Amino acid sequence: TDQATPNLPSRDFDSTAAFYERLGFGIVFRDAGWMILQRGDLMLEFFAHPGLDPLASWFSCCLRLDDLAEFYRQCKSVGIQETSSGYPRIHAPELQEWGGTMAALVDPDGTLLRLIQNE
Amino acid sequence: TDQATPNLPSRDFDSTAAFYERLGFGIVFRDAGWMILQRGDLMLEFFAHPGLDPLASWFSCCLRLDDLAEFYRQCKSVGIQETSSGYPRIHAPELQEWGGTMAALVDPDGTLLRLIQNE
């Protein structure tokens, strides 16, 4: 079926790939400049962006899930730090100003993945 | 169901919205700092990025469609230029180096939308 997937930057496909495999994602494809991961219907696509600054990055995306808790349980179990400085880190699910519950995830490359709880 | 959606920038929600509406997309949600457009199962999300350079931007995403042809018929019929310079523009479907047929669409902020045929 029709569907739009994001394109996120990676300073090293190996690390990226390694980091997402621990969450349930795997490799659907991997070229020298393009890699695709996937966990269930969640599919993310990366591209090489060597000249990127993880601290000045504005890249992000949403992961609207049916069970944010479970998925957050995993991020913790895989050892992602629950700090408020540096990357990668996670912030527990908090009721957002817009009425939705959303947890934050910052991948190895400073990309922000807004974890939202599907309604 | 669990999905992944892109986070694209928007120098002006009005101009953006206008642009996408012509492609069958319609607003699902609109706030002051966040907009969500939808079309069937496709769903993009936008954010305010006034200090963005449409020429130096690296933002993009994939629209894996069941009928790339028709979707491209819309982009054409609504007047999008098929040039190779300037934005917004489009590039006819070309068999990609990875064995897939993909057409390229660039919106008013220089964001690349890879129109790929679903296998």
Swiss-Prot record, chains A, B:
Q: Which GO terms describe its biological process?
A: response to antibiotic
InterPro entries given for it? Bleomycin-R, Glyas_Bleomycin-R_OHBP_Dase, Glyas_Fos-R_dOase_dom, VOC
All residue ranges annotated as the VOC domain in the record: 1-118
Q: Which UniProt keywords apply?
A: Antibiotic resistance, Transposable element
Q: Which domain of life is it from?
A: Bacteria
Pfam families reported for this sequence = Glyoxalase (PF00903)
Q: Which PROSITE patterns match?
A: VOC
Please tell me what else the database record remarks about this protein.
This enzyme is encoded by the kanamycin and neomycin resistance transposon Tn5.
According to its UniProt entry, what is the function of this protein?
Binding protein with a strong affinity to the bleomycin family of antibiotics. Binds to CL990; an antimitotic-antibiotic compound.
Concerning its family, UniProt says: Belongs to the bleomycin resistance protein family.
Q: What is this protein called?
A: Bleomycin resistance protein
The gene that this protein is the product of is ble
